[PDB]
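@channel anyone free to eyeball this complex?
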Amino acid sequence: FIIKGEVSRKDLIREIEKAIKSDELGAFIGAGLSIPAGFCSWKELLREPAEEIGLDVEKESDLVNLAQYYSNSKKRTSIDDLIKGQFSQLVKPTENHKLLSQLPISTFWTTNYDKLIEKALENNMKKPYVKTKDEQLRGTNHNFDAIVYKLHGDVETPEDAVITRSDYEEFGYNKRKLFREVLEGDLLTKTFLFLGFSFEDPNFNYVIGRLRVLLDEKNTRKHYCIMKRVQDADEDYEYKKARQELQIEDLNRYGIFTYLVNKYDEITEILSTLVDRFRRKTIFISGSAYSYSAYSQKTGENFIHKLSFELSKNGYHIVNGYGKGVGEFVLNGVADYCLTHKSKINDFLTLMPFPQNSSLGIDLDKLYKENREQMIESCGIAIFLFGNKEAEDIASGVMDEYELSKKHGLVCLPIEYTGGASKEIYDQTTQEISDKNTISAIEQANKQCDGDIDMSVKNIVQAVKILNK
Amino acid sequence: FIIKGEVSRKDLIREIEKAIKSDELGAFIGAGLSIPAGFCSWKELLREPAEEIGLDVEKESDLVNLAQYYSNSKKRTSIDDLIKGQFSQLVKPTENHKLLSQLPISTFWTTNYDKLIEKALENNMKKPYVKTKDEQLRGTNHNFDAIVYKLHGDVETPEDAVITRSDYEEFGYNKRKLFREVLEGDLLTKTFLFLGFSFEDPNFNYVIGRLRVLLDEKNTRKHYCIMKRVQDADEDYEYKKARQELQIEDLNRYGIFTYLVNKYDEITEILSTLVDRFRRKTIFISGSAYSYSAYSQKTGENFIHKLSFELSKNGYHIVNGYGKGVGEFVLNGVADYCLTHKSKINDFLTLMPFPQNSSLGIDLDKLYKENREQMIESCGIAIFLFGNKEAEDIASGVMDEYELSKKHGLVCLPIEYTGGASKEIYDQTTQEISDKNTISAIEQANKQCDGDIDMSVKNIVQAVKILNK
Amino acid sequence: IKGEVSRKDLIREIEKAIKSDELGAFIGAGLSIPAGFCSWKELLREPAEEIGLDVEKESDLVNLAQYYSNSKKRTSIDDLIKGQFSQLVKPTENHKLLSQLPISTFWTTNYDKLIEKALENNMKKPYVKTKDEQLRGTNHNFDAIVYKLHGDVETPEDAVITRSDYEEFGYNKRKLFREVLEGDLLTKTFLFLGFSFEDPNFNYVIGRLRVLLDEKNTRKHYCIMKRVQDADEDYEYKKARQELQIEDLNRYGIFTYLVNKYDEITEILSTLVDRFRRKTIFISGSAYSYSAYSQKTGENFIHKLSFELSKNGYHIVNGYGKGVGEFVLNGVADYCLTHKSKINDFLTLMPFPQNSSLGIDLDKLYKENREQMIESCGIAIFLFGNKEAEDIASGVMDEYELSKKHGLVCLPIEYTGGASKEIYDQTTQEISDKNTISAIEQANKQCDGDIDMSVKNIVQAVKILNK
Amino acid sequence: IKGEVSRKDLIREIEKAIKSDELGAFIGAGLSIPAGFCSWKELLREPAEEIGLDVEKESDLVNLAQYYSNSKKRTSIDDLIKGQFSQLVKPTENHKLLSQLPISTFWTTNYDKLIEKALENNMKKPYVKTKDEQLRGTNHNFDAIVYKLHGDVETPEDAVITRSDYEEFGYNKRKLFREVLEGDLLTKTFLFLGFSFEDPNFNYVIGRLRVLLDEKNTRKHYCIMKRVQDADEDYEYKKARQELQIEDLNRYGIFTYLVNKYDEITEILSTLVDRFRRKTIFISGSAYSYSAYSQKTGENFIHKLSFELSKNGYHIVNGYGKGVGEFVLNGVADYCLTHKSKINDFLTLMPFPQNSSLGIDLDKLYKENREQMIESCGIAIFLFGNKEAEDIASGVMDEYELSKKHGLVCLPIEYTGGASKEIYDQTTQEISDKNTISAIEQANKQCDGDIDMSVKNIVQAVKILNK
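replying in thread with the prediction:
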């Protein structure tokens, strides 16, 4: 963490959180992230081809030149068939891919030929626009949730894929004319997180050459990367560590810093950390109230109103299941906020009501329960309120939503002085806590706020703010 | 309408509606659209400057060369001061600007130096991203509601504005390096509507030169323009008409077609036509029901559910004021639709609830009423339902919303067999109709649908579809 | 007015560019219209009526040509330039003078081939470049290149005429012309001739020089244009417009000289030709006997004179005469061997063989080459002029009349005798110029057997003629 | 194997490019390392240890140079090339042979100045181009240009060495080299010499030729490389790799010849020099008396021989001898006047003046110029060789020994007499080649007074030597 360009895990997270706080975060990904999913390294992929022309893949230092010689002796199609085959595998994305989908990353650039990165987004609520030819980059578009640039092409059109040496030589001339400037722009404006790459890749020199724009002293821009530290098992340990050090110091010239893991699992540990800490910006609200315990009806209505309002004032997104007695006034508070500050409500509120009569005339409970889980896994905090009706002392839905939040690792914030299932969750859950931050938030929220609502809503707001740091 | 490149008003509207139906619509605007707002033509703006160097503006055919000579004799600053002054005028946008803001135009390109085009959007709900230097075009951005390219610069930085001849010569070299490719892309991908321009502009040749990409036979792309037909008052009528004809036939080489008005007011007539016809894609729903007339509670709930559901199935956006008894189930129906087809609700529903307790502790009725009018002017249809409580035979809010819809020219669709204020509006309004399409929709909706809900919701859906053609 | 210059200032700076081979020429319609070609206004009159527009009312002839090409297809303008621009007209006196000057880089917007043939009407080997394929790579062999920016009449389908032919310039065709022109503009000093702010394509032409606006531009270029005339309506107004336009050009490093009649162009070029010709001298004579000198002394006087003429950077044209020319070769060969140079760089010979190569008369061809060779010289030095029994050698006297025909400064030497001395007795009485007379006096001074004094006299007389 | 060619095929196609002046040369480290420069592996050994890396373990020396430049600032490599590459080493025999060949365009990646000085070690005027400012515009004067793609040792701070020096190539610096190289590659036929697939910068170098992959490329280029050797480990494997690599080059229109020792390069260049030299001939002699001919007949025989030698496209080198050389000039002048050509294009003279220009001995300088001039000729023709009383003229016999020194094909004429006939009597007995003997027989045939038969004999003997 003093080798030039080296940074600590906390340094990495701090700067990444700046990029997230300013919507300047993008992702740059390579083969190192898809190989753990089940895809073949290029060495083995070229082993049999290498033997098919009379050369040993173990003897060749530059696999790019090897693919070129192969394309010459066995016609180009024979590499298309190699990529069409060994990269169209029916493989599931990794957990890293899902965590990347959950993050606020709108721009993705990748050199691998697989389609895992798109599927992680399609599985989440995001609908990517995957771009592979100049014709898609022309002009501008504002619509899609995210853009996935397939810089080195895609497995759906391998005859155009960037594989051989002359495919890199002809990059931008016969093909991909506009990729260069769009990539250089994203590199100078966004803060990028680099993942699936290694200095020992075969295509590395060609990949790094595109970043020549970052050598301009006027760059000022910083990007961050992750790679595996050299390991004792690796023979020539000290020598390869020196090589890797000089390789990172060379990398830092382009404004890229590096964090070093010891096994690739550690990558996920960071991504998850960033997902969880980001999820706490999105809160889940549960409850149902025919009666508002010690509060009068209008007082229990305006307490909810002023709580959702204050949560919007501090920049928090709300997910609610539009419960009886609760949802109308969560909406009312957020509408009061957005009307006060000429803001848009859909920027702050996502609802999950429970329909009565499916128009199609078919049960939708399965679909509804899945939608609910999809919304909840995007949340990081769960606040529970009331949970009572004339015949429900402990409303069922509230308890079901607590168990569901307990599954997704949400920080649970039951409110004791509301009664009902909310207080049942307080009485049960308070015995199952161990962390200082969570305990501090729980205590800060359930205070004896005199019944008075201003202090009552604040207590909860400060409990929320505590969990964000 | 047989001169090459000439088209009829109905032709123009048809093709424009294709571009709207495919989100491929953009706008290209010039000085001819801001002069009616109160700004000075360049001829008069250069009259005193022309005299300030010993030349008569009446004698000079090329005002661009005139601005160049002026910048030479009187230093460049003296033109900056000319633009800083005579273009920073505290002028209101025109009705054309507001109509353009109301349309689904996400990309705007303009050569004028004023800021009317941004203000028309800021007045509407849209928040434009005005781009003036390459640094803003680098990379990509997905966030903003619309992009306003100031191709020839802006009055906020006149020292960089494109004015003189050498400012066109140095276009793209010392300044505006990326504007050329972004503009060419938008021209080859979007369908553009050209407005504030004339063949007699002084900067015309330079402006049209950028479109050389459209001369490639592989262009296939079509764009549309509007200009004033020559008028008897114009001396040399027949000769100038021949010149204008050949000018349009030359224009059509770049894939641009032309419609000819006789006075500029006619422009607005078309824009309005496109706004109104587009507004009918967005429906306003009004009502309030403690009791559901001849329907049981659950039956009146599921009727609303199945109506909003069917309206979402046919691709219509809903604006509702979350009324008593009505809003919960408008939301429920749209949520049923979006959950059935894994769609997002905010794409279909915009709400305007009426809060009870302002958290700030100040009356918000003024703000709420303005928000309501802003939402309603975006709608083209108004459907009224029920409008009754225990003490309200004719709910007040429903009548107030009818008078408000009557102000904004909405097609009013009251439902008779719901009773209440809805039926009061039917009984009063049906005497104030004159158009075939509106009358046909009103009759198609209020049919004797047996009380049965499937036919009842259809009746209304077909009444809506009728007004869209 | 900024950007205006004096005629003598113009000649001085242009001659500086000549001194460093940094001189190129940029030519336009103003040089081809006087030869017999039709102005564009008239050339487009009948077409203009052919679409319903009047050339008298249309100020923008480029857009007019576009409209015509639109209604009547491209072919009909391919046929138009093929017609009234394919006239096989002889180049003007300006063209021949430019051929005589050391201009190796020619750029032109004209569609005719006048300047190319004017160069062909000489010892020059022009290489006309009109397509990118010719600009590719590098080549040094050809004597000069004529760059045709706006195409040529042999391929009018590619000519740059209409507006969109300018719009598509450099993208579909003529891709390399842009950067190569900018290079020549940033390295050479260019002389602009056939152009006026009132041309129809001016706005389009001037855009190509935008590189000269870079403040890092040290290069200066020069142009010649027609001054406004009282008869011209709005006289003072057009004088003001032209004044401000001249100040506008200077942004590109272009200066302007103003003529009152187009003849002045020829007067300047002619002047520059004359003053350039004096760097290369013609020598005449023949010595069967070495008068006033012993044989060896008359041989080495010639040898040591040609050597010093080469040392002072003057090119020699000689007819390899017996006894006079014979040793000029040896003297210049001694120079080039002394200074590791090549002989043809300093000596051009004009011999007369004894036997035709394979049976053909050569007298006419020889004299034609001779007259053209003398038109390349600016000074004519005469020496000896005697044969077996001819006190006044035959060729030398006619060569005096021939140098007098081509306006060469005649510098005969008296103390050599023969036809040279008869020409001396004639020329000293048939002159009126102070500089010429002063140089002649500096040349015919003498110490006698001391030959260095003679060689000095002659060399210093030459330098006097070059001031 | 595709892209391999025969030695005679190589010579034939290269001589086609020579016949059209379309020949250029592309040179690399393989020609400068044998002269005395250090391979890069060793040059980077001490630096490699200076950062903790072994050149024996690092396969990518470009990335290695980058790492070193990163830890130790750029200056320390500026100093490195300044040191072990600034050795003032003499050019090799290959360099001198390339100087003797008609190669006007030279492109090289080397940082030394061997090829430039080898050209300076001749009559050549090299113009070394290393910065964009020199490529701007156009110029035809200089005798040849040496393009230094990767910089020069005089400005190592700009040299292309590290990886990022290749990345920043054409963007910050050397902006115009890319398009000008592509032009020369698409128009000229280039001969590649000092390169191998095992070079460290090869991947980077080959990318510049991507334009040659355009299917519209008709141009063919040629290279020479070292064949694999049995001693080399993995012999058959390296033969397979090199085979596939040779087939890879042909995509760029590049063909390959394979040597077994680097000497073969010199053998090919030498061969091409010899066969090119025979297009230019040296003539010796002097005729105080015109043996076997009347005076006028011996004059016009020489005249009409030089004329026909010019007609058949052969350049003449003559020492302007009295009676022999004197009329060569007249004959070639008649030719150039007949065919509107310039004399120095066909005739190069080597005179010997009577009096030093201003008092300096010239014998040594004259003979040095002479030996270099004869090394430019491939055939030596001897004629007459007599003086006032010298049956065997002095200069001519030594010139026979001199042509024998430089390996010229000696073609003396018997029926002229003098030293020429003594050389004829010596040479006919001192030869062994069939072609040389056949041409000599074709030359010394005779009809006699009929001079056309004599001129034929000689010209046809020349053409026999050029087959």
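from a first look: The CA atoms of residues 304 and 460 of chain D lie 15 Å apart.
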